Amino acid sequence: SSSVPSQKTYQGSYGFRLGFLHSGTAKSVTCTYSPALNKMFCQLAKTCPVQLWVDSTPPPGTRVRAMAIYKQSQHMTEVVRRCPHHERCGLAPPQHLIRVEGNLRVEYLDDRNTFRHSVVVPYEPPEVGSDCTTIHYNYMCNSSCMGGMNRRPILTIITLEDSSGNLLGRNSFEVRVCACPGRDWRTEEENLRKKG
Amino acid sequence: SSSVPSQKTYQGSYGFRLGFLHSGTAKSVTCTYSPALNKMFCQLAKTCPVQLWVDSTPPPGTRVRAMAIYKQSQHMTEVVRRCPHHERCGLAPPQHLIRVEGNLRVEYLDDRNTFRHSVVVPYEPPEVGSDCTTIHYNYMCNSSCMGGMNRRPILTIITLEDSSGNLLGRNSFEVRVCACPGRDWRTEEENLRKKG
DNA sequence: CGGGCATGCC
DNA sequence: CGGGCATGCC
Ligand SMILES: [Zn+2]
Ligand SMILES: [Zn+2]
């Protein structure tokens, strides 16, 4: 069986979608999202809020899993890991790229067969008056980190799963972790218009 | 006592000097030396020949030690180490930046008090007809390596020591380990002329 | 903060 | 190979 997780969007019977809060497009804004590229630009070790939207209520015990995969075909089969420097320098294993902050029920998985890392939290329905649920993700390396992502773009795959392990929904977005998300967002959108 | 080793030139009673073989100044020549800057530009994990010249014959049992120190005052007291990436990826301990190739009597020292790394080989007199002795050094990180030198320039300190531990001579040269020694040499010499 | 150097890599 | 992008940092 494949050790490469699926990245194909599957909004599913609950109408599962992701949302992202708009930002101020300063050169070094901490986080900004491009709808045109379906791509988050963010800084390392700083909060990246991701909204979960659903049309129907998931059952009790639903979980939310995040997992990184390399976007380029030639790197898809390599597990995405923290670089040795940031690994060397209290729940998250130091090898995990993606953390969740602000949740008391976070679980970190090292898959015993595929060796892939993932981080899971319970799904919580949005509070009254609110239309979505926000998870605070953290990426612990830059996309450029030598010995880690090494300038290779990744996708974050967000899966909605029931307690039995059924896939309820899947979405993904590209990520560039970088020093200057505003500059790099502008550059990539201009490149899309001029050369895409 | 100081844990910062001396970098002051001490040619000494044997007339100890260093020599460097000229190169072709291609953009990515493997090694090239600037007399004006007293600075070697070289590529990582590739041979860097350094010549030992003396006016008088060192006694039997003389040793040749190499040690890296950061050139900038604000970094002088930090031990120069291999970065975590190149450490993770058969005599040299993986934490040592400087290796010697082509010698059967190499010793690697981790100083128990100063924590400084050094690599030592016996001094051999130049063969008949030859005016100097060549040691093949290897630098196992780029100057830019994140978590290691991190773009901070270093000096290599070469000391001539008798078997009793007396300092016979000391010389040093700055090093930039980089992908394109020819380009970076030209840039730094032009910067010296224009802004030095 | 935004302009521009940096430097392994394309 | 040398021109020029790359991107954390100055
Ligand atoms: Zn890293
Ligand atoms: Zn290194």
Tab-separated table of C-alpha atoms (C1' of nucleotides) and ligand atoms in Angstrom:
chain	number	residue	atom	x	y	z
A	1	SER	CA	0.000	0.000	0.000
A	2	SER	CA	1.086	3.587	-0.576
A	3	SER	CA	3.039	5.445	2.088
A	4	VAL	CA	2.168	8.717	0.306
A	5	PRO	CA	-0.949	10.278	1.879
A	6	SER	CA	-3.682	11.608	-0.349
A	7	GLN	CA	-3.747	15.349	-0.991
A	8	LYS	CA	-6.926	15.396	-3.090
A	9	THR	CA	-9.615	17.746	-1.817
A	10	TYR	CA	-12.635	15.857	-0.474
A	11	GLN	CA	-15.117	18.319	1.019
A	12	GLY	CA	-17.385	15.366	1.809
A	13	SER	CA	-20.875	15.013	3.238
A	14	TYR	CA	-20.236	17.594	5.986
A	15	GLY	CA	-19.190	20.348	3.555
A	16	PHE	CA	-15.728	20.712	5.081
A	17	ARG	CA	-13.724	23.776	4.012
A	18	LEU	CA	-10.815	25.801	5.375
A	19	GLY	CA	-10.784	29.529	6.066
A	20	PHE	CA	-7.976	32.012	6.623
A	21	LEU	CA	-8.028	35.403	8.321
A	22	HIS	CA	-6.924	38.324	6.155
A	23	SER	CA	-3.789	40.282	7.044
A	24	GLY	CA	-2.156	43.657	6.425
A	25	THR	CA	0.365	42.719	3.685
A	26	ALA	CA	3.304	44.378	5.412
A	27	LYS	CA	6.650	43.056	4.176
A	28	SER	CA	7.115	40.853	7.266
A	29	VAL	CA	3.495	40.308	8.339
A	30	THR	CA	3.489	37.162	10.462
A	31	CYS	CA	0.925	35.318	8.302
A	32	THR	CA	-0.929	35.994	5.041
A	33	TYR	CA	-2.949	33.776	2.709
A	34	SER	CA	-3.273	33.863	-1.088
A	35	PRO	CA	-6.616	32.565	-2.405
A	36	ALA	CA	-5.278	32.617	-5.972
A	37	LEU	CA	-2.393	30.305	-5.068
A	38	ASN	CA	-4.189	28.470	-2.227
A	39	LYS	CA	-1.014	29.159	-0.303
A	40	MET	CA	-0.179	30.355	3.196
A	41	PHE	CA	2.892	32.540	3.732
A	42	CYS	CA	3.979	32.637	7.369
A	43	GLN	CA	6.917	32.975	9.748
A	44	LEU	CA	8.510	30.135	11.667
A	45	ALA	CA	7.438	29.400	15.253
A	46	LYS	CA	4.602	31.968	15.061
A	47	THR	CA	0.868	31.285	15.271
A	48	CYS	CA	-0.884	30.467	11.989
A	49	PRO	CA	-4.672	30.444	12.534
A	50	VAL	CA	-6.648	28.081	10.299
A	51	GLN	CA	-10.450	28.076	10.320
A	52	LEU	CA	-12.544	24.922	9.970
A	53	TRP	CA	-15.910	25.428	8.248
A	54	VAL	CA	-18.616	22.768	7.889
A	55	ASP	CA	-22.166	22.768	6.529
A	56	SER	CA	-23.266	19.892	8.790
A	57	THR	CA	-22.305	18.963	12.334
A	58	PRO	CA	-19.621	16.264	12.658
A	59	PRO	CA	-20.426	13.445	15.075
A	60	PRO	CA	-19.056	13.411	18.627
A	61	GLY	CA	-15.450	12.280	18.757
A	62	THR	CA	-14.417	13.743	15.396
A	63	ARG	CA	-10.698	14.588	15.156
A	64	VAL	CA	-8.697	17.123	13.125
A	65	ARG	CA	-5.347	15.933	11.763
A	66	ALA	CA	-2.628	18.009	10.097
A	67	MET	CA	0.201	16.526	8.043
A	68	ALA	CA	2.860	17.981	5.754
A	69	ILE	CA	3.841	16.510	2.380
A	70	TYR	CA	6.239	17.819	-0.242
A	71	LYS	CA	4.381	19.347	-3.175
A	72	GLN	CA	6.822	18.415	-5.959
A	73	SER	CA	6.425	14.928	-7.418
A	74	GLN	CA	10.134	14.165	-7.069
A	75	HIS	CA	10.008	14.837	-3.301
A	76	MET	CA	6.513	13.486	-2.505
A	77	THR	CA	7.811	10.224	-1.055
A	78	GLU	CA	10.187	11.913	1.444
A	79	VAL	CA	8.793	12.458	4.939
A	80	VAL	CA	8.640	16.144	5.896
A	81	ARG	CA	10.717	16.655	9.054
A	82	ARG	CA	12.151	19.406	11.194
A	83	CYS	CA	15.713	20.273	10.199
A	84	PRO	CA	18.553	19.077	12.479
A	85	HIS	CA	19.320	22.606	13.715
A	86	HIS	CA	15.810	23.464	14.900
A	87	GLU	CA	15.416	19.921	16.239
A	88	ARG	CA	18.488	20.399	18.443
A	89	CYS	CA	17.491	23.862	19.682
A	90	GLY	CA	6.922	20.215	25.945
A	91	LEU	CA	4.613	17.754	24.202
A	92	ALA	CA	5.757	18.061	20.584
A	93	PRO	CA	8.618	15.714	19.619
A	94	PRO	CA	11.471	17.868	18.277
A	95	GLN	CA	11.346	16.115	14.881
A	96	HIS	CA	7.806	17.352	14.129
A	97	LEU	CA	7.492	20.352	11.819
A	98	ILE	CA	3.860	21.188	12.646
A	99	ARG	CA	2.650	21.961	16.173
A	100	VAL	CA	-0.708	23.024	17.574
A	101	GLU	CA	-0.793	25.702	20.273
A	102	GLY	CA	-3.601	26.486	22.684
A	103	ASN	CA	-5.126	23.001	22.951
A	104	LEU	CA	-5.017	20.658	25.937
A	105	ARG	CA	-5.756	17.500	23.917
A	106	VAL	CA	-3.054	17.595	21.243
A	107	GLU	CA	-1.628	14.277	20.059
A	108	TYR	CA	1.512	13.839	17.973
A	109	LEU	CA	1.733	10.684	15.853
A	110	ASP	CA	4.796	9.050	14.294
A	111	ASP	CA	3.282	6.493	11.933
A	112	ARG	CA	4.918	3.129	12.572
A	113	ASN	CA	4.605	2.036	8.921
A	114	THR	CA	4.832	5.220	6.821
A	115	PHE	CA	7.069	7.199	9.256
A	116	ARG	CA	4.928	10.283	8.559
A	117	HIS	CA	4.349	12.853	11.291
A	118	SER	CA	0.951	14.276	12.099
A	119	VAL	CA	-0.692	16.319	14.841
A	120	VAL	CA	-4.316	15.774	15.896
A	121	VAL	CA	-6.791	17.680	18.069
A	122	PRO	CA	-10.468	17.040	18.801
A	123	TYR	CA	-12.928	18.804	16.552
A	124	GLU	CA	-14.953	21.357	18.471
A	125	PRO	CA	-18.111	22.873	16.980
A	126	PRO	CA	-18.027	26.652	16.560
A	127	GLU	CA	-19.393	28.596	19.503
A	128	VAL	CA	-22.806	30.230	19.246
A	129	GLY	CA	-22.748	33.194	16.883
A	130	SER	CA	-19.523	31.963	15.245
A	131	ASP	CA	-19.446	30.256	11.860
A	132	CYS	CA	-16.158	28.345	12.174
A	133	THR	CA	-13.574	26.749	14.470
A	134	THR	CA	-9.990	28.032	14.618
A	135	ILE	CA	-6.876	25.924	15.212
A	136	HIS	CA	-3.569	27.658	15.962
A	137	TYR	CA	-0.871	25.894	13.947
A	138	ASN	CA	2.886	26.488	14.234
A	139	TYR	CA	5.565	25.629	11.650
A	140	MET	CA	8.918	25.134	13.367
A	141	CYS	CA	11.217	25.546	10.321
A	142	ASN	CA	11.491	27.928	7.421
A	143	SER	CA	10.777	26.399	4.013
A	144	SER	CA	14.460	27.109	3.266
A	145	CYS	CA	15.933	25.201	6.254
A	146	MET	CA	19.045	23.293	5.231
A	147	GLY	CA	18.703	19.610	6.069
A	148	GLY	CA	14.929	19.961	6.377
A	149	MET	CA	12.489	21.288	3.795
A	150	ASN	CA	15.533	22.758	2.004
A	151	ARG	CA	13.467	25.269	-0.056
A	152	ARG	CA	10.987	22.582	-1.185
A	153	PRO	CA	7.358	23.766	-0.922
A	154	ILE	CA	4.994	21.689	1.203
A	155	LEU	CA	1.270	21.166	1.448
A	156	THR	CA	-0.481	20.998	4.793
A	157	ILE	CA	-3.220	18.340	4.588
A	158	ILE	CA	-6.098	18.857	7.034
A	159	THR	CA	-8.305	15.800	7.469
A	160	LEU	CA	-11.576	15.555	9.383
A	161	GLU	CA	-11.875	12.013	10.774
A	162	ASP	CA	-14.439	10.349	12.984
A	163	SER	CA	-13.351	8.451	16.086
A	164	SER	CA	-13.559	5.184	14.099
A	165	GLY	CA	-10.961	6.417	11.580
A	166	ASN	CA	-13.329	7.163	8.695
A	167	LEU	CA	-12.274	10.048	6.476
A	168	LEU	CA	-15.017	12.666	6.707
A	169	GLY	CA	-13.280	15.471	4.811
A	170	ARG	CA	-9.910	16.510	3.439
A	171	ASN	CA	-8.488	19.879	2.425
A	172	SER	CA	-5.005	21.194	1.797
A	173	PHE	CA	-3.065	24.393	1.261
A	174	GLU	CA	0.487	25.131	0.193
A	175	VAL	CA	2.807	26.705	2.773
A	176	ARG	CA	5.907	28.857	2.528
A	177	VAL	CA	7.466	29.509	5.911
A	178	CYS	CA	9.749	32.496	5.391
A	179	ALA	CA	11.144	35.628	7.006
A	180	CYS	CA	9.057	38.090	4.947
A	181	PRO	CA	5.629	36.634	4.105
A	182	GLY	CA	4.347	39.898	2.621
A	183	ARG	CA	7.258	40.307	0.210
A	184	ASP	CA	7.201	36.664	-0.827
A	185	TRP	CA	3.417	36.602	-1.305
A	186	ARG	CA	3.581	39.647	-3.584
A	187	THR	CA	6.473	38.151	-5.555
A	188	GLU	CA	4.725	34.829	-6.135
A	189	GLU	CA	1.411	36.390	-7.165
A	190	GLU	CA	3.226	38.706	-9.576
A	191	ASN	CA	5.106	35.702	-10.974
A	192	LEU	CA	1.779	33.921	-11.485
A	193	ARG	CA	0.385	36.857	-13.472
A	194	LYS	CA	3.522	37.387	-15.565
A	195	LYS	CA	4.817	33.833	-16.122
A	196	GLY	CA	2.113	31.409	-14.951
B	1	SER	CA	43.032	31.737	32.409
B	2	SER	CA	41.682	32.604	28.973
B	3	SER	CA	39.772	30.022	26.961
B	4	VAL	CA	40.322	32.181	23.851
B	5	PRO	CA	43.417	30.982	21.953
B	6	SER	CA	45.923	33.508	20.708
B	7	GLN	CA	45.706	34.530	17.059
B	8	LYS	CA	48.746	36.826	17.047
B	9	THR	CA	51.347	35.977	14.422
B	10	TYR	CA	54.557	34.648	15.977
B	11	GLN	CA	56.957	33.579	13.229
B	12	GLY	CA	59.455	32.641	15.945
B	13	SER	CA	63.038	31.414	15.939
B	14	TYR	CA	62.394	28.909	13.123
B	15	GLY	CA	61.031	31.534	10.708
B	16	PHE	CA	57.648	29.831	10.389
B	17	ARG	CA	55.389	31.074	7.578
B	18	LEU	CA	52.440	29.738	5.595
B	19	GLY	CA	52.206	29.430	1.823
B	20	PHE	CA	49.280	28.948	-0.537
B	21	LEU	CA	49.210	27.611	-4.086
B	22	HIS	CA	47.794	29.987	-6.691
B	23	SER	CA	44.595	29.101	-8.545
B	24	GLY	CA	42.712	29.953	-11.733
B	25	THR	CA	40.101	32.413	-10.364
B	26	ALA	CA	37.167	30.676	-12.021
B	27	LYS	CA	33.847	31.551	-10.382
B	28	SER	CA	33.709	28.228	-8.495
B	29	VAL	CA	37.413	27.343	-8.280
B	30	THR	CA	37.749	24.915	-5.382
B	31	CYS	CA	40.296	27.039	-3.474
B	32	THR	CA	41.908	30.465	-3.908
B	33	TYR	CA	43.928	32.685	-1.578
B	34	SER	CA	44.022	36.485	-1.281
B	35	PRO	CA	47.359	37.877	-0.051
B	36	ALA	CA	45.814	41.336	0.354
B	37	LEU	CA	43.144	40.015	2.723
B	38	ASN	CA	45.219	37.124	4.139
B	39	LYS	CA	42.124	35.078	3.437
B	40	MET	CA	41.420	31.672	1.929
B	41	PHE	CA	38.249	31.164	-0.117
B	42	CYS	CA	37.375	27.492	-0.534
B	43	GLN	CA	34.565	24.973	-0.949
B	44	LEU	CA	33.275	22.676	1.760
B	45	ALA	CA	34.602	19.111	2.047
B	46	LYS	CA	37.248	19.748	-0.648
B	47	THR	CA	41.025	19.713	-0.211
B	48	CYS	CA	42.631	23.002	0.846
B	49	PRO	CA	46.438	22.705	0.588
B	50	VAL	CA	48.429	24.812	3.055
B	51	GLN	CA	52.218	25.037	2.834
B	52	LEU	CA	54.489	25.200	5.879
B	53	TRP	CA	57.708	27.180	5.362
B	54	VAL	CA	60.556	27.441	7.881
B	55	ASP	CA	64.012	29.022	7.816
B	56	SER	CA	65.428	26.557	10.368
B	57	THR	CA	64.739	22.881	10.971
B	58	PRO	CA	62.260	22.110	13.773
B	59	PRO	CA	63.388	19.475	16.269
B	60	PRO	CA	62.233	15.856	16.007
B	61	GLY	CA	58.722	15.377	17.327
B	62	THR	CA	57.401	18.796	16.291
B	63	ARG	CA	53.628	18.877	15.696
B	64	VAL	CA	51.349	21.022	13.513
B	65	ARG	CA	48.010	22.034	15.035
B	66	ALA	CA	45.069	23.722	13.310
B	67	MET	CA	42.227	25.426	15.166
B	68	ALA	CA	39.349	27.673	14.119
B	69	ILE	CA	38.270	30.808	15.994
B	70	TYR	CA	35.642	33.388	15.113
B	71	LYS	CA	37.221	36.577	13.798
B	72	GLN	CA	34.686	39.086	15.161
B	73	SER	CA	35.224	40.205	18.753
B	74	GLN	CA	31.599	39.538	19.691
B	75	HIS	CA	31.902	35.876	18.618
B	76	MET	CA	35.518	35.175	19.670
B	77	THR	CA	34.522	33.318	22.830
B	78	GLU	CA	32.193	30.855	21.029
B	79	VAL	CA	33.751	27.532	20.036
B	80	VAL	CA	33.719	26.968	16.267
B	81	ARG	CA	31.802	23.750	15.547
B	82	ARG	CA	30.320	21.814	12.674
B	83	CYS	CA	26.657	22.658	12.128
B	84	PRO	CA	24.039	20.087	13.240
B	85	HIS	CA	23.118	19.170	9.651
B	86	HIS	CA	26.629	18.310	8.469
B	87	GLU	CA	27.330	16.646	11.821
B	88	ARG	CA	24.368	14.306	11.293
B	89	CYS	CA	25.208	13.494	7.665
B	90	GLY	CA	36.342	7.594	10.002
B	91	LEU	CA	38.700	9.223	12.495
B	92	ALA	CA	37.328	12.772	12.640
B	93	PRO	CA	34.574	13.304	15.240
B	94	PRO	CA	31.514	14.670	13.411
B	95	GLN	CA	31.552	17.870	15.504
B	96	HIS	CA	34.954	18.973	14.147
B	97	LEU	CA	34.937	21.593	11.396
B	98	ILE	CA	38.548	21.094	10.265
B	99	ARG	CA	39.910	17.750	9.053
B	100	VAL	CA	43.269	16.687	7.652
B	101	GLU	CA	43.336	14.286	4.704
B	102	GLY	CA	46.225	12.156	3.505
B	103	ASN	CA	47.986	11.635	6.847
B	104	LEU	CA	48.205	8.425	8.863
B	105	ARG	CA	49.029	10.156	12.169
B	106	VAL	CA	46.174	12.644	12.516
B	107	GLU	CA	44.901	13.388	16.018
B	108	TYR	CA	41.678	15.209	16.859
B	109	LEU	CA	41.539	16.977	20.228
B	110	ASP	CA	38.503	18.159	22.194
B	111	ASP	CA	40.039	20.341	24.893
B	112	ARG	CA	38.666	19.256	28.261
B	113	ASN	CA	38.835	22.789	29.714
B	114	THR	CA	38.278	25.184	26.790
B	115	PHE	CA	36.064	22.823	24.698
B	116	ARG	CA	37.955	23.969	21.585
B	117	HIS	CA	38.524	21.557	18.711
B	118	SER	CA	41.864	21.121	17.014
B	119	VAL	CA	43.528	18.715	14.598
B	120	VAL	CA	47.236	17.848	14.815
B	121	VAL	CA	49.705	16.046	12.548
B	122	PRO	CA	53.453	15.494	12.890
B	123	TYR	CA	55.657	18.067	11.232
B	124	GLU	CA	57.619	16.555	8.377
B	125	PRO	CA	60.579	18.395	6.844
B	126	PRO	CA	60.225	19.192	3.143
B	127	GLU	CA	61.632	16.558	0.821
B	128	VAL	CA	64.910	17.202	-0.974
B	129	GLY	CA	64.520	19.846	-3.662
B	130	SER	CA	61.292	21.136	-2.078
B	131	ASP	CA	61.128	24.317	-0.021
B	132	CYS	CA	57.995	23.597	2.036
B	133	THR	CA	55.660	20.987	3.528
B	134	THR	CA	52.014	20.737	2.450
B	135	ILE	CA	49.085	19.730	4.662
B	136	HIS	CA	45.722	18.946	3.055
B	137	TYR	CA	43.030	20.590	5.178
B	138	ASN	CA	39.266	20.122	4.778
B	139	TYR	CA	36.502	22.425	6.062
B	140	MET	CA	33.295	20.452	6.569
B	141	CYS	CA	30.799	23.367	6.616
B	142	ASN	CA	30.201	26.471	4.576
B	143	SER	CA	30.812	29.744	6.412
B	144	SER	CA	27.053	30.318	6.002
B	145	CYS	CA	25.885	27.062	7.666
B	146	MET	CA	22.850	27.680	9.851
B	147	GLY	CA	23.479	26.494	13.399
B	148	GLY	CA	27.234	26.470	12.796
B	149	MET	CA	29.427	29.328	11.609
B	150	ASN	CA	26.194	31.057	10.518
B	151	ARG	CA	27.967	33.493	8.123
B	152	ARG	CA	30.546	34.501	10.764
B	153	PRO	CA	34.100	34.598	9.347
B	154	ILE	CA	36.715	32.430	11.045
B	155	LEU	CA	40.472	32.376	11.321
B	156	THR	CA	42.424	29.153	11.030
B	157	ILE	CA	45.313	29.263	13.529
B	158	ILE	CA	48.291	27.076	12.588
B	159	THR	CA	50.714	26.476	15.447
B	160	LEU	CA	54.100	24.764	15.296
B	161	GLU	CA	54.710	23.041	18.647
B	162	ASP	CA	57.503	20.845	19.914
B	163	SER	CA	56.724	17.501	21.535
B	164	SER	CA	57.028	19.154	24.975
B	165	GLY	CA	54.212	21.611	24.171
B	166	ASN	CA	56.352	24.706	23.597
B	167	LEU	CA	54.983	27.133	21.030
B	168	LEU	CA	57.559	27.349	18.245
B	169	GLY	CA	55.534	29.405	15.763
B	170	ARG	CA	52.029	30.653	15.075
B	171	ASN	CA	50.334	31.911	11.921
B	172	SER	CA	46.742	32.442	10.888
B	173	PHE	CA	44.570	33.173	7.882
B	174	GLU	CA	40.921	34.077	7.471
B	175	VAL	CA	38.658	31.526	5.771
B	176	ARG	CA	35.416	31.787	3.844
B	177	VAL	CA	34.018	28.393	2.929
B	178	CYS	CA	31.520	29.066	0.153
B	179	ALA	CA	30.021	27.690	-3.044
B	180	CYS	CA	31.819	30.122	-5.393
B	181	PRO	CA	35.279	31.032	-4.060
B	182	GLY	CA	36.256	32.922	-7.218
B	183	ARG	CA	33.188	35.167	-7.198
B	184	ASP	CA	33.421	35.829	-3.475
B	185	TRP	CA	37.167	36.543	-3.586
B	186	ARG	CA	36.671	39.105	-6.357
B	187	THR	CA	33.772	40.721	-4.494
B	188	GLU	CA	35.696	41.072	-1.237
B	189	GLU	CA	38.835	42.469	-2.872
B	190	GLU	CA	36.735	44.981	-4.809
B	191	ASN	CA	34.976	45.940	-1.569
B	192	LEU	CA	38.375	46.482	0.058
B	193	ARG	CA	39.456	48.845	-2.728
B	194	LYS	CA	36.174	50.772	-2.849
B	195	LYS	CA	35.083	50.878	0.814
B	196	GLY	CA	38.003	49.644	2.938
C	1	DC	C1'	9.448	49.414	9.017
C	2	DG	C1'	10.881	48.758	3.811
C	3	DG	C1'	15.250	48.912	0.839
C	4	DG	C1'	18.757	46.085	-0.371
C	5	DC	C1'	22.731	42.877	0.580
C	6	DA	C1'	23.573	37.665	1.002
C	7	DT	C1'	24.923	33.296	-1.157
C	8	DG	C1'	23.704	28.374	-2.217
C	9	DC	C1'	21.559	27.019	-6.025
C	10	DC	C1'	19.041	27.095	-10.743
D	1	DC	C1'	30.930	27.211	-17.041
D	2	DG	C1'	29.239	32.219	-15.755
D	3	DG	C1'	24.703	34.900	-15.337
D	4	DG	C1'	21.323	35.585	-12.197
D	5	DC	C1'	17.628	34.054	-8.880
D	6	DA	C1'	17.154	33.049	-3.702
D	7	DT	C1'	15.967	34.658	0.943
D	8	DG	C1'	17.441	35.287	5.870
D	9	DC	C1'	19.442	39.069	7.491
D	10	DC	C1'	21.668	43.924	7.768
E	1	ZN	ZN	14.772	24.408	10.533
E	2	ZN	ZN	27.345	22.809	7.933
